[PDB]
Write a protein that binds this ligand. Structure first.
Ligand SMILES: Nc1ncnc2c1ncn2[C@@H]1O[C@H](COP(=O)(O)OP(=O)(O)O)[C@@H](O)[C@H]1O
Ligand SMILES: [Ca+2]
Ligand SMILES: [Ca+2]
Ligand SMILES: [Ca+2]
Ligand code: NA
Lengths: 355, 140
């Protein structure tokens, strides 16, 4: 009897079996047809995002995503699999109850549990104490955890992630004359973002370097054969993570939200949080983002503070991997809500077992 | 939070590795073996495999009372341990912490950078090559 791990992301669903080292199903969280089957017949229906900024808003489209996960992607009978779901930090109590309601009444799972995404990434990094920087497609979070328990009052939220970074790269790529408009071209911009972008150590010195020589220029061959050249757009795109003003957002950068999130904790544990900055999410994959985060946090912290940035090589799935590890432990599954307990208490039991 | 402690404590009762732990002053050692907490034989205490993750429970007498028991729980991460073994050791450390009523203080030890509190548990500490195979199933 294998447990199911489904990471409901704002842009990508990560699903698979507990005990595996990687999710077996990764598809976009888009409804139309769902995912790859919907991006093909895109000129017929409208594509909506059921999970914008990490919170599930429309439950009918979410039900379609979960149905697509169980039957079309993983090809499993939901009635024969305990299922572990993930949620964004500070998830409302009602939104947790609806997840339990759909899992038991619509899919009839024998057991269910909803876990915090950032806590799974910390466990996946082999830690019980630390502050997680989870930057995915729709939302970016700073979540401190001490000895296995998250600190909700210090959690920072920033509605700026990979989706906005893709659009900002699309915008600045027009300066060189390129035009990426169609839905197919937006996937090419995402590919350019994931392949050639990087975080500058000193932004102003790289801006002057890009204007001084052509050593930072990179070439990229489009599917139609056209070869384009990209310059300072490589590091101007992920710079929005540290300067949200690049897209007109009056918010603090990821380095400041991390620093602020630490300051909202007890002084005894700040020393441990500075040495355990765990990065999670696909938007934390830019080369050089750890060195830049190291440089910015050092400038904000006391001079004697030992600071360490942890960037796991597969932090793109660290949320799911931590779920696969925890769901492989029998004592963890013991806390899961069984179908009998749901049939007795109802949907409010998610707040009595899931933490 | 008081109901959270109730279910976390009830969950820790289903691990046989904690039955009898922290009962007397000493050092108890477990090794993570394919998502399972396996006790390390006494003859092998102090020898840790560079590719595995361990849980080390140090029961001692606190300075504030020589007739009482305090706990220092350390999970030791080998330089070549896999993600499953390190993550299970981290979670099970919190689980043993809850099993003993939150009293244990948690320490994260990595090979070659262990704290003085952890090194003091051995007169002594020998690192061995190899380790138990990962519990992960590889996805091609
Ligand atoms: N190597 C990379 N470099 C830059 N961005 C990346 C890379 N890999 C993935 N991303 C971005 O990360 C986002 C997906 O991250 P993910 O953690 O799956 O988000 P969520 O969990 O919210 O679905 C996408 O927007 C994608 O563009
Ligand atoms: Ca996510
Ligand atoms: Ca091993
Ligand atoms: Ca404790
Ligand atoms: Na896919």
């Amino acid at each position: 009897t294998t447990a199911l791990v489904c990471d409901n992301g704002s842009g990508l669903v990560k699903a698979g079996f507990a005990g595996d080292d990687a999710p077996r199903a990764v598809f976009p969280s888009i409804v139309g047809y769902v995912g790859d089957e919907a991006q093909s017949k895109r000129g017929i229906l409208t594509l909506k995002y059921p999970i914008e900024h990490g919170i599930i808003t429309n439950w009918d489209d979410m039900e379609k995503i979960w149905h697509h996960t169980f039957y079309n992607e993983l090809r499993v009978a939901p009635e024969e699999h305990p299922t572990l779901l993930t949620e964004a930090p500070l998830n409302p109590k009602a939104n947790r109850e609806k997840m339990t309601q759909i899992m038991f009444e619509t899919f009839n799972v024998p057991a269910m549990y909803v876990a915090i995404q950032a806590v799974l990434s910390l466990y996946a990094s082999g830690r019980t104490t630390g502050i997680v920087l989870d930057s995915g497609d729709g939302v970016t979070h700073n979540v401190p955890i001490y000895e296995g328990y998250a600190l909700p009052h210090a959690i920072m939220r920033l509605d700026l992630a990979g989706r906005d970074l893709t659009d900002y790269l699309m915008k600045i790529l027009t300066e060189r004359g390129y035009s990426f408009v169609t839905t197919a071209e937006r996937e090419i911009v995402r590919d350019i973002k994931e392949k050639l972008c990087y975080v500058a150590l000193d932004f102003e010195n790289e801006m002057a370097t890009a204007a001084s020589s052509s050593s930072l220029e990179k070439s990229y061959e489009l599917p139609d054969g056209q070869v384009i050249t990209i310059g300072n757009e490589r590091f101007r795109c992920p710079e929005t993570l540290f300067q949200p003003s690049f897209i007109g957002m009056e918010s603090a950068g990821i380095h400041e939200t991390t620093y602020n999130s630490i300051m909202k904790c007890d002084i005894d544990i700040r020393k441990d949080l500075y040495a355990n900055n765990v990065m999670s999410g696909g938007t934390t994959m830019y080369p050089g983002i750890a060195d830049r985060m190291q440089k910015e946090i050092t400038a904000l912290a006391p001079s004697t503070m030992k600071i360490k940035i942890i960037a796991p090589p597969e932090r793109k799935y660290s949320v799911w991997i931590g779920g696969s590890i925890l769901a492989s432990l029998s004592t963890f599954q013991q806390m899961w809500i069984t179908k009998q307990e749901y049939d007795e208490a109802g949907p409010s039991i998610v707040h009595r077992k899931c933490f | 939070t008081e109901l959270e402690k109730k279910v976390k404590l009830e969950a820790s009762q289903h691990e046989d590795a904690w039955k009898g732990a922290g009962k007397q002053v000493g050092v108890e050692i477990w090794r993570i073996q394919q998502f399972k907490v396996v006790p390390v034989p006494k003859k092998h205490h102090g020898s840790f495999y560079t590719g595995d993750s361990y849980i080390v429970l140090s029961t001692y007498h606190p300075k504030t009372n020589p007739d009482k028991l305090a706990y220092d729980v350390h999970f030791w991460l080998g330089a070549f341990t896999t993600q499953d073994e390190a993550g299970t050791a981290a979670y099970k450390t919190v689980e043993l912490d809850d099993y003993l009523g939150g009293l244990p203080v948690q320490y994260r030890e990595v090979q070659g950078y262990e704290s003085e509190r952890f090194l003091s548990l051995f007169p002594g500490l020998r690192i061995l090559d190899g380790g138990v195979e990962t519990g992960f199933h590889h996805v091609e």
